[PDB]
Amino acid sequence: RPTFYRQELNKTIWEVPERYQNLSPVGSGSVCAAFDTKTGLRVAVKKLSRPFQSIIHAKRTYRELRLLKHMKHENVIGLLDVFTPARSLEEFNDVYLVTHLMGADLNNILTDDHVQFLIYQILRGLKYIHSADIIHRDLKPSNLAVNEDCELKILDVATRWYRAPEIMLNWMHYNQTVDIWSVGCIMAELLTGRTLFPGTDHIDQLKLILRLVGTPGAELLKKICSESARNYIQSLTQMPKMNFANVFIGANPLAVDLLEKMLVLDSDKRITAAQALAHAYFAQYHDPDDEPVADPYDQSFESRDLLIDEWKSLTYDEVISFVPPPLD
Ligand SMILES: *CCC(=O)Nc1cccc(-c2nc(NCCc3ccccc3)c3ccc(N)cc3n2)c1
């Protein structure tokens, strides 16, 4: 049990172990930069905001901790530490997460070669995440962190701009490739310097998307069992598939080709992360022996309806059982 110390930061009391020094805020729960003495690393220490305020906050807290404890991969943010100043369950009310501090995000940050390397990295993390039966669902430049070495990590600017059109429409059975769509949108933005689909709202968003990919065909329409949604696209302006070479003019044709394969309206046809990794565009980085998959992840909690105190107590169990990663 380490020795904690108290400190008020930006109107909030941070109580953290002495191992973490020089706390310094970085934005918004809220996050501090710190120096970690046990490792030598600059780290981010996140103090969760009202973790157990409602069933939904509590379950969300639990979910985030479970996910972070699971992720062990170079291109996904994982957990250096988790702690609470609480001495027991009864007084458990605060959660702090410690992760690697990353320089910047993609929102900040291009050459075709730079783009290859960042998109390759996102796809490699996504392979790993998808292998655990996890869908990120909110990939966007601000959720992708890069250090000065250009090394990229996924973690968790309008969300709507990067969202698969099946989510816009509230399809209940969307698959992992929603994240592939997002990557497509990010990649286009890196290669062109412009938000591919900067919708002002969800109708505008689909309107912009359909201008590029084309109104949907019979093969896709027949998979749609809602006349509501069906009657939309039918009704919505009836345009043809644009030629990506004509839209991404002068870009590497292999990049345009991968873009074609990611930005497919029919998620059953959209390329997977593993597939996109073996695409020619990543010829210079792709190595199928260095593209690992994840241990399986127990998501059964997601279907459970529990009391606040039960989500809380599960979370406390996960704090207590945390095994930090080795030094290397
Ligand atoms: C049964 C209830 C139902 O059909 N629900 C529903 C609602 C909305 C969408 C789908 C659906 N969507 C897609 N993706 C196409 C999205 C889209 C977006 C903008 C314009 C046109 C189309 C699906 C893709 C692939 C399959 N197999 C099913 C899909 N269902 C469903």
Say how many domains are in the chain.
2
Mutate to test the pocket of ligand 1, among 160, 171, 232 (most ligand atoms within 8 A of CB): 171
How many CA atoms within 13 Å lie on the side-chain side of 135? 17
Cβ 171 under 6 angstroms from ligand 1: yes
What is the token pair recorded at 215? 């109104």
Q: Which domain holds residue 46?
A: 14-103
Query: What 3-state class would DSSP assign to 87?
Result: coil
Helix residue ranges per DSSP H, 152-237: 165-168, 178-192, 202-213, 218-221, 227-235
Q: Are residues 98 and 117 in the same domain?
A: no
Looking up residue 242, the CATH number of its domain turns out to be 1.10.510.10
Residue 49 annotated in ligand binding:
no
Is 156 considered catalytic here?
Answer: yes
User: Looking at the domain assignment, is residue 127 inside a domain?
Assistant: yes
| Whether residue 226 has its Cβ less than 6 Å from ligand 1 | yes
Exposed / middle / buried, residue 2 (Cβ in 10 Å: 0-12, 13-18, 19+): exposed
Whether residue 137 is found in the same domain as residue 213: yes
C-alpha separations of 297 from 23, 100, 133, 301 in Å: 33, 22, 7, 11
Q: Same domain, yes or no, for 254 and 217?
A: yes
Same domain assignment for residues 96 and 203: no
Q: Is 129 inside any structural domain?
A: yes
Same domain for 274 and 228?
A: yes
Based on the domain organization, do 243 and 116 belong to the same domain? yes
- Whether 32 and 117 map to the same domain: the answer is no
Same domain, 140 and 167: yes
The one-character DSSP state at 279 is S
How far apart (Å, rounded) are the C-alpha atoms in residues 315 and 312?
5
Please give the Cα distance from 19 to 34 (Å, whole number). Answer: 10
Q: Which of 105, 133, 156, 309 is the catalytic position?
A: 156
Q: For residues 298, 299, 303 and 308, what is the CA-based torsion angle, rounded to 10 degrees?
A: 90
CA of 171 to the centre of ligand 1 (A): 6
**Are both 21 and 86 inside the same structural domain?**
yes
- Resolution of the solved structure (Å): 2.0
From which experimental method does this structure derive? X-ray
Tell me, yes or no, whether 179 and 127 share the same domain.
yes
Q: 28 labelled as ligand-binding?
A: yes
